[PDB]
Design an enzyme around this catalytic site. Sequence first.
Site, PDB file in Angstrom:
ATOM      1  N   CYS B 120     -14.165 -35.402  55.069  1.00 25.90           N
ATOM      2  CA  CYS B 120     -15.350 -35.767  54.291  1.00 25.90           C
ATOM      3  C   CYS B 120     -15.914 -34.615  53.436  1.00 25.90           C
ATOM      4  CB  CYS B 120     -16.450 -36.276  55.225  1.00 25.90           C
ATOM      5  SG  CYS B 120     -17.815 -36.912  54.221  1.00 25.90           S
ATOM      6  N   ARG B 123     -20.170 -33.857  53.426  1.00 29.05           N
ATOM      7  CA  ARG B 123     -20.897 -33.380  54.594  1.00 29.05           C
ATOM      8  C   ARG B 123     -22.176 -32.561  54.397  1.00 29.05           C
ATOM      9  NH1 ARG B 123     -16.302 -30.877  58.050  1.00 29.05           N
ATOM     10  NH2 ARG B 123     -15.135 -31.017  56.077  1.00 29.05           N
ATOM     11  N   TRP B 292     -22.322 -42.837  49.811  1.00 30.68           N
ATOM     12  CA  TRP B 292     -22.201 -43.275  48.429  1.00 30.68           C
ATOM     13  C   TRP B 292     -20.876 -42.724  47.918  1.00 30.68           C
ATOM     14  CZ3 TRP B 292     -26.823 -40.431  49.644  1.00 30.68           C
ATOM     15  CH2 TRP B 292     -26.727 -39.046  49.406  1.00 30.68           C
ATOM     16  N   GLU B 297     -12.888 -41.645  43.923  1.00 30.82           N
ATOM     17  CA  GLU B 297     -12.478 -42.659  44.892  1.00 30.82           C
ATOM     18  C   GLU B 297     -12.191 -43.971  44.170  1.00 30.82           C
ATOM     19  OE1 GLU B 297     -15.936 -41.753  47.568  1.00 30.82           O
ATOM     20  OE2 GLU B 297     -14.624 -42.669  49.069  1.00 30.82           O
TER      21      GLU B 297
HETATM   22  C1  HEM Z   1     -23.380 -39.305  51.136  1.00 34.44           C
HETATM   23  C2  HEM Z   1     -22.178 -39.572  50.555  1.00 34.44           C
HETATM   24  C3  HEM Z   1     -20.896 -39.284  51.021  1.00 34.44           C
HETATM   25  C4  HEM Z   1     -19.868 -38.910  50.199  1.00 34.44           C
HETATM   26  C5  HEM Z   1     -19.949 -38.600  48.701  1.00 34.44           C
HETATM   27  C6  HEM Z   1     -18.665 -38.827  50.994  1.00 34.44           C
HETATM   28  C7  HEM Z   1     -17.406 -38.784  50.400  1.00 34.44           C
HETATM   29  C8  HEM Z   1     -16.224 -38.999  51.078  1.00 34.44           C
HETATM   30  C9  HEM Z   1     -14.930 -39.027  50.439  1.00 34.44           C
HETATM   31  C10 HEM Z   1     -14.567 -38.640  49.002  1.00 34.44           C
HETATM   32  C11 HEM Z   1     -14.075 -39.443  51.395  1.00 34.44           C
HETATM   33  C12 HEM Z   1     -12.608 -39.805  51.178  1.00 34.44           C
HETATM   34  C13 HEM Z   1     -12.357 -41.286  50.961  1.00 34.44           C
HETATM   35  C14 HEM Z   1     -10.876 -41.624  50.891  1.00 34.44           C
HETATM   36  O1  HEM Z   1     -10.113 -40.847  50.283  1.00 34.44           O
HETATM   37  O2  HEM Z   1     -10.473 -42.678  51.429  1.00 34.44           O
HETATM   38  C15 HEM Z   1     -14.800 -39.542  52.656  1.00 34.44           C
HETATM   39  C16 HEM Z   1     -14.198 -39.657  53.919  1.00 34.44           C
HETATM   40  C17 HEM Z   1     -14.896 -39.658  55.137  1.00 34.44           C
HETATM   41  N1  HEM Z   1     -16.273 -39.593  55.257  1.00 34.44           N
HETATM   42 FE1  HEM Z   1     -17.602 -39.183  53.834  1.00 34.44          FE
HETATM   43  N2  HEM Z   1     -18.922 -39.113  52.336  1.00 34.44           N
HETATM   44  C18 HEM Z   1     -20.299 -39.451  52.350  1.00 34.44           C
HETATM   45  C19 HEM Z   1     -20.929 -40.100  53.432  1.00 34.44           C
HETATM   46  C20 HEM Z   1     -20.319 -40.341  54.673  1.00 34.44           C
HETATM   47  C21 HEM Z   1     -21.048 -40.768  55.847  1.00 34.44           C
HETATM   48  C22 HEM Z   1     -22.520 -41.188  55.828  1.00 34.44           C
HETATM   49  C23 HEM Z   1     -20.196 -40.673  56.933  1.00 34.44           C
HETATM   50  C24 HEM Z   1     -20.392 -41.023  58.286  1.00 34.44           C
HETATM   51  C25 HEM Z   1     -21.574 -41.137  58.947  1.00 34.44           C
HETATM   52  C26 HEM Z   1     -18.929 -40.192  56.398  1.00 34.44           C
HETATM   53  C27 HEM Z   1     -17.749 -40.053  57.158  1.00 34.44           C
HETATM   54  C28 HEM Z   1     -16.494 -39.803  56.616  1.00 34.44           C
HETATM   55  C29 HEM Z   1     -15.244 -39.920  57.362  1.00 34.44           C
HETATM   56  C30 HEM Z   1     -14.996 -40.106  58.864  1.00 34.44           C
HETATM   57  C31 HEM Z   1     -14.268 -39.845  56.437  1.00 34.44           C
HETATM   58  C32 HEM Z   1     -12.787 -40.061  56.669  1.00 34.44           C
HETATM   59  C33 HEM Z   1     -12.447 -41.541  56.617  1.00 34.44           C
HETATM   60  C34 HEM Z   1     -10.960 -41.781  56.520  1.00 34.44           C
HETATM   61  O3  HEM Z   1     -10.200 -41.090  57.231  1.00 34.44           O
HETATM   62  O4  HEM Z   1     -10.546 -42.662  55.742  1.00 34.44           O
HETATM   63  N3  HEM Z   1     -18.995 -39.978  55.002  1.00 34.44           N
HETATM   64  N4  HEM Z   1     -16.146 -39.276  52.466  1.00 34.44           N
END
Ligand code: HEM
Lengths: 414, 416
Positions: B120, B123, B292, B297
């Site tokens: 992520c 973070r 968001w 993406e």
């Molecule tokens: C506030 C905005 C946030 C942004 C901009 C962000 C952005 C991202 C991006 C770019 C990815 C990769 C997506 C992909 O390639 O499939 C991702 C993966 C991830 N994010 Fe975040 N994130 C945010 C919020 C969250 C929240 C609120 C959580 C959990 C409470 C979170 C948990 C994770 C996890 C576990 C992954 C890995 C999921 C996977 O393995 O497919 N994210 N996030």
Amino acid sequence: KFPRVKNWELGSITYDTLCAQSQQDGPCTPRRCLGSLVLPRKLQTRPSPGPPPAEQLLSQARDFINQYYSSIKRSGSQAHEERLQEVEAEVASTGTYHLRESELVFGAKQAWRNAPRCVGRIQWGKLQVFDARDCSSAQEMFTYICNHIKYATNRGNLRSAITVFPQRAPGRGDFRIWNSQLVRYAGYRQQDGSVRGDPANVEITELCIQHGWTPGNGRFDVLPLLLQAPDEAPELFVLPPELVLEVPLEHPTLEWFAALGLRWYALPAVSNMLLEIGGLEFSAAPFSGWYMSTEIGTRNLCDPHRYNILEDVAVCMDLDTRTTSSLWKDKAAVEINLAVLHSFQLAKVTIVDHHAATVSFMKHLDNEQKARGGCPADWAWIVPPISGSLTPVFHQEMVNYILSPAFRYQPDPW
Amino acid sequence: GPKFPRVKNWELGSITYDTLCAQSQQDGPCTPRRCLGSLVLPRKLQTRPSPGPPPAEQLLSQARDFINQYYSSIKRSGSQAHEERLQEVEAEVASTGTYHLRESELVFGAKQAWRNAPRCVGRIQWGKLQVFDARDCSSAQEMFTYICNHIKYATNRGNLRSAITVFPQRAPGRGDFRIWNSQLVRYAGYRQQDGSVRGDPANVEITELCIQHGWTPGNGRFDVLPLLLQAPDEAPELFVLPPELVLEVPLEHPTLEWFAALGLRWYALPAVSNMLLEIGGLEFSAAPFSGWYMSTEIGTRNLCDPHRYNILEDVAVCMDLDTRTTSSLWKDKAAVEINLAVLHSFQLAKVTIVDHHAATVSFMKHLDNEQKARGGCPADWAWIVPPISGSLTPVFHQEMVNYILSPAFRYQPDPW
Ligand code: HEM
Ligand code: HEM
Ligand SMILES: C[C@H](O)[C@H](O)[C@H]1CNc2nc(N)[nH]c(=O)c2N1
Ligand SMILES: C[C@H](O)[C@H](O)[C@H]1CNc2nc(N)[nH]c(=O)c2N1
Ligand SMILES: [Zn+2]
């Protein structure tokens, strides 16, 4: 036991069994992955003042020789057996041995083949090997290097080549090429710490000046070579301008681009890496192929710690550099890579774009899957610095490991 | 010097040491022999269904570790409340085989899991998360209500707010609460007679599953799929999301007037719903979370991937680029405009979104904060660097150490 490797764009799956042949350890452990790191410390190449453990060396030697004879379908032959006995005999009495030109040629090609960070390995079978183990001075190294450059450049029709200088010897200084590439643009520390030229070459630029070189004051001044013979202070050699082919950069449609006065050399010749074959180490073994446009257009010209020309081209393109969301950076980067490809093709100098290059690497992966059961590849290095997911390699899982022959990093001589 | 991984940033030439990895209690896929850091699902964390109750011994160890993390987070480590809470967890596992988390402990774990997510890039927002406790949910219908409230609060009419909804944890030999869809919002993937796919090829299976469960399929390129929600020991029930609750953005380009004629669009809310949330050994098989989108993406992966919408060629043909040769970089040019269209359209609609530059810059700041707060930050380089303009962003030049820390979000086998 053996990793299951998947390509997410196609659904295809393979199992890497070749990794089983790795006898050298990487930087990773089950507790944490360090695959994104550029340099090791455990995988470096420590001093050679004493003779390498005969047991170790002999083992590596027998293995390589075994490899060689398999390659010429003469495994278990009479020659194979007698060659092993020779190596045993030489190591046992002198604590080392020597390779035959044919074996050297085989080792060099295998090192390239095993290079996890090389995206152009589909060309691994076509390599001109210049044996320069008959080199006894810095001046001789220079002549060899000048011939390698003449040959490899071939008036713009680049041909892959490598020159191998004497192997390291216990208790004796190494033959070393101080420059990281045979062609490097000077990096002059000016005014407020800023840098004119190539920031990546500041240190080597200073060492050259320190050894008598009369510096210039341009952004693209070709540096001299600091060639060093065992236990001797390095020597300064100026490369004949007619030998260093360069390409003036212009844009196919953007008339003003040419004004920027940008240029780049045609020959990508790494010269600071160590070549290891059958336990033998070659501290000076410069190799060259041809550039993949992103190396110049994206990393060399656009890196923030390199020429960093992104904003300039953006302003010339009249782009909104006020915010990130306008993607002015992405837009100028694409035009700069286009300009590199355009210019090189116009100058009739070999070059490959990242789409063509990665497509060919995918074919190579397949050839190797059938030929050896796998292919060591460093994902972070194979995927182009721009348009990552727009290439096939981005969607391809890869296994990384150390096979020998191999090109390894080594300490800077100073 | 230091006995920990030496990490370097090659742009700034700065060095740091990651000592946090020393806290990792779970092994990853690499070994000194070979690196598997590029595999999407190496058989590691993979929370495969482990029906029969877990070794009380193993759970206790995980539970005590988590409780320690919690009391440390509130700065009461070693106190009487800490030791009493520890005694309570042990007693509960000793008599029931499992235990339960206090409210504030769940909130803490939810955030720590996000904070610990190696893949992520967002973070830096880890401290700001709305945690909806839904551990009282006892039906698939109630699951649907919870999810709808989540979407409403999270979407917040364009001004998105990160959130997670935690349903009942896995229990001794009992059925799991599961959301079959990988995301709360998914576009149908219709397999054609000629073999092609209309819509999103990524959702072909889930689409065929909804059909097999009574959903009357459409034939559009962007039909929002219904949800397959499954309460313990029950077959999944089908629920259709109220159109008004699913905010979507029509895509247009700021200067290429014909782009809107393509009729492309995407939904505003990124809600992952198939991952398992693990805290102190407890496993929440259903705990959808959302933040968001980062423009790439949508603009690079979802729209340009060969196995997704694959609109690269169509947009290039429209831009009248030479699609007959790689060296024209028509793929690169089309990709940039498509990504710009996503940023432009979302801004226009006043829906939260962040470009790959702003996002990576903020992640670098996050790395700085974490180096100070915990002495490191687990990060998966291949997933942190954006799918386009990789080296144009700061993360490309930052070495990263990847490792598994708990609480954590893990992949889990599909319920079917
Ligand atoms: C506030 C905005 C946030 C942004 C901009 C962000 C952005 C991202 C991006 C770019 C990815 C990769 C997506 C992909 O390639 O499939 C991702 C993966 C991830 N994010 Fe975040 N994130 C945010 C919020 C969250 C929240 C609120 C959580 C959990 C409470 C979170 C948990 C994770 C996890 C576990 C992954 C890995 C999921 C996977 O393995 O497919 N994210 N996030
Ligand atoms: C035929 C054309 C070739 C092309 C297009 C090609 C392309 C590349 C590229 C893009 C890189 C990464 C450069 C960087 O990011 O710094 C690279 C690395 C590498 N290549 Fe190739 N290569 C070719 C020929 C060769 C040859 C002839 C050898 C050796 C005999 C070779 C050995 C390597 C090695 C060892 C690396 C890693 C170097 C390092 O770690 O700095 N390549 N190559
Ligand atoms: C930190 C990270 O490992 C580093 O920036 C790597 C990434 N990928 C690369 N890939 C190539 N081809 N060349 C490089 O120099 C790098 N640098
Ligand atoms: C094979 C390779 O691991 C795979 O394509 C990864 C690379 N990086 C990624 N990065 C993000 N953010 N999302 C992904 O789905 C992927 N896929
Ligand atoms: Zn690894």
